[PDB]
Design a protein around this motif. Structure first.
Motif, PDB file in Angstrom:
ATOM      1  N   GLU A 286     -20.414  72.387  77.038  1.00  0.00           N
ATOM      2  CA  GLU A 286     -21.337  73.068  76.120  1.00  0.00           C
ATOM      3  C   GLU A 286     -20.580  73.773  74.986  1.00  0.00           C
ATOM      4  OE1 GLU A 286     -22.752  77.083  77.936  1.00  0.00           O
ATOM      5  OE2 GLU A 286     -22.899  75.674  79.615  1.00  0.00           O
ATOM      6  N   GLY A 287     -20.770  73.263  73.767  1.00  0.00           N
ATOM      7  CA  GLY A 287     -20.108  73.824  72.596  1.00  0.00           C
ATOM      8  C   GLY A 287     -18.934  72.981  72.126  1.00  0.00           C
ATOM      9  N   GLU A 288     -18.795  71.786  72.711  1.00  0.00           N
ATOM     10  CA  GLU A 288     -17.718  70.859  72.366  1.00  0.00           C
ATOM     11  C   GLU A 288     -18.288  69.575  71.768  1.00  0.00           C
ATOM     12  OE1 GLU A 288     -14.725  72.484  72.150  1.00  0.00           O
ATOM     13  OE2 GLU A 288     -13.675  71.096  73.491  1.00  0.00           O
ATOM     14  N   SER A 289     -17.442  68.839  71.039  1.00  0.00           N
ATOM     15  CA  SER A 289     -17.847  67.586  70.397  1.00  0.00           C
ATOM     16  C   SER A 289     -17.834  66.420  71.383  1.00  0.00           C
ATOM     17  CB  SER A 289     -16.928  67.281  69.215  1.00  0.00           C
ATOM     18  OG  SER A 289     -15.568  67.226  69.617  1.00  0.00           O
TER      19      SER A 289
ATOM     20  N   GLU B 143     -19.236  66.298  63.515  1.00  0.00           N
ATOM     21  CA  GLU B 143     -19.353  65.575  64.783  1.00  0.00           C
ATOM     22  C   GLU B 143     -20.421  66.215  65.693  1.00  0.00           C
ATOM     23  OE1 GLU B 143     -15.517  66.653  64.178  1.00  0.00           O
ATOM     24  OE2 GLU B 143     -16.858  68.386  64.016  1.00  0.00           O
ATOM     25  N   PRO B 144     -21.181  65.398  66.495  1.00  0.00           N
ATOM     26  CA  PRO B 144     -22.232  65.918  67.404  1.00  0.00           C
ATOM     27  C   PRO B 144     -21.683  66.812  68.520  1.00  0.00           C
ATOM     28  CG  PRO B 144     -21.840  63.578  67.826  1.00  0.00           C
ATOM     29  CD  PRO B 144     -21.092  63.918  66.567  1.00  0.00           C
ATOM     30  N   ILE B 145     -22.556  67.664  69.066  1.00  0.00           N
ATOM     31  CA  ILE B 145     -22.181  68.589  70.140  1.00  0.00           C
ATOM     32  C   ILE B 145     -23.096  68.383  71.352  1.00  0.00           C
ATOM     33  CG2 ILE B 145     -21.589  71.033  70.680  1.00  0.00           C
ATOM     34  CD1 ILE B 145     -20.178  69.845  68.087  1.00  0.00           C
ATOM     35  N   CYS B 146     -22.570  68.704  72.539  1.00  0.00           N
ATOM     36  CA  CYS B 146     -23.312  68.569  73.789  1.00  0.00           C
ATOM     37  C   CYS B 146     -24.100  69.850  74.096  1.00  0.00           C
ATOM     38  CB  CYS B 146     -22.340  68.260  74.933  1.00  0.00           C
ATOM     39  SG  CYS B 146     -22.005  66.485  75.186  1.00  0.00           S
ATOM     40  N   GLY B 147     -25.430  69.721  74.170  1.00  0.00           N
ATOM     41  CA  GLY B 147     -26.289  70.866  74.449  1.00  0.00           C
ATOM     42  C   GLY B 147     -27.595  70.489  75.123  1.00  0.00           C
ATOM     43  N   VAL B 148     -28.075  71.372  76.010  1.00  0.00           N
ATOM     44  CA  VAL B 148     -29.334  71.158  76.739  1.00  0.00           C
ATOM     45  C   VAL B 148     -30.512  71.808  76.004  1.00  0.00           C
ATOM     46  CG1 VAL B 148     -28.642  70.653  79.134  1.00  0.00           C
ATOM     47  CG2 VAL B 148     -28.552  73.016  78.333  1.00  0.00           C
TER      48      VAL B 148
ATOM     49  N   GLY C 113     -24.787  67.791  81.987  1.00  0.00           N
ATOM     50  CA  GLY C 113     -26.011  67.058  81.679  1.00  0.00           C
ATOM     51  C   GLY C 113     -26.601  67.454  80.336  1.00  0.00           C
ATOM     52  N   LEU C 114     -25.714  67.739  79.373  1.00  0.00           N
ATOM     53  CA  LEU C 114     -26.103  68.146  78.021  1.00  0.00           C
ATOM     54  C   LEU C 114     -26.449  66.929  77.154  1.00  0.00           C
ATOM     55  CD1 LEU C 114     -22.929  70.267  78.068  1.00  0.00           C
ATOM     56  CD2 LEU C 114     -25.109  71.428  77.728  1.00  0.00           C
TER      57      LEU C 114
END
Length: 32
Positions: free
Chosen positions: A6-9, A27-32, A18-19
């Motif tokens: 969470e908060g990384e590319s 660049e896109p980031i992983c988030g729920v 499961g983000l």
């Protein structure tokens, strides 16, 4: 860890908790 948390590319590796890859710039980031 090798996966993007969470908060990384996620331009090289997927999410961890499961983000979702958000259409963030540059660049896109992983988030729920």
């Amino acid at each position: 860890q090798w996966c993007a948390e969470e908060g990384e590319s996620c331009e090289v590796y997927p999410c961890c908790d499961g983000l979702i890859c958000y259409p963030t710039f540059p660049e896109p980031i992983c988030g729920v």
